[PDB]
């Protein structure tokens, strides 16, 4: 029984398991805390445990390590990676800074630690609009996600310089206007919760535009929802609100990187103390400055 083995190893290692909302149901069921990128970042600043097992993708485990440099942070598989975050390279940031030296560099937390070393502040889908609104500039450098950048431009009225030019999430790019039409036909009493990583014409059909954390916060506003994000979010919402109804917009909206994490390799992570997540001190310090500024804003 992997679940009983994991529970005993958690105790033996003085470990906490942090899980993203897109983790497999059986992984969510053994996590101590579950949340979106911003909540996982905040939760990483009050870790009393000695070991963090991060059931999520590599940039998320790195963010936890940046905020807990003297704790052991484990990722259960090094193949748990984010295709969108990998699209942004330091070269892109440097070129944009050359053109707009007075523009703050605003990096989605969906980014490498190397990239965050060049950020003035980080953001998530939950706080991107608030942060960019308060920055002392009418133009900001922003990436990697161009669909979130479109949403931020619309809501703040500021000029958004995307880095790179085509950054996007293949999972959320799957959603189309035909999925909106089918959801409206199959569930005519449901409202639509849509992630800002979806394309702009789908965003415009939303009843609410929100990160997964915002979806959880605003689900109380209606009793039936079609969920335009990675399909494991439906399980999360059904567990939190058993009295509501939730439907996937597309069952095939799956993140391969997220599903590199399994119950078995969480067990192996605790058993073998692997895979240890490390961030170079110079990169971590600079990234930490931008992430702390995000939490302060
Ligand atoms: C990209 C994300 C993923 C999510 O919405 O859970 C974020 O900013 O929180
Ligand atoms: S769902 Fe998209 S943005 Fe999130 S980890 Fe997977 S590839 Fe990255
Ligand atoms: Cl409730
Ligand atoms: N100013």
Swiss-Prot record:
Keywords: 4Fe-4S, Cytoplasm, Iron, Iron-sulfur, Metal-binding, Pyridine nucleotide biosynthesis, Transferase. Pfam families: NadA. One of its GO terms (biological process) is 'de novo' NAD biosynthetic process from L-aspartate. Pathway: Cofactor biosynthesis; NAD(+) biosynthesis; quinolinate from iminoaspartate: step 1/1. It catalyses: iminosuccinate + dihydroxyacetone phosphate = quinolinate + phosphate + 2 H2O + H(+). Its main location: cytoplasm. Catalyzes the condensation of iminoaspartate with dihydroxyacetone phosphate to form quinolinate. Belongs to the quinolinate synthase family. Type 2 subfamily. This is Quinolinate synthase. It comes from Pyrococcus horikoshii (strain ATCC 700860 / DSM 12428 / JCM 9974 / NBRC 100139 / OT-3).
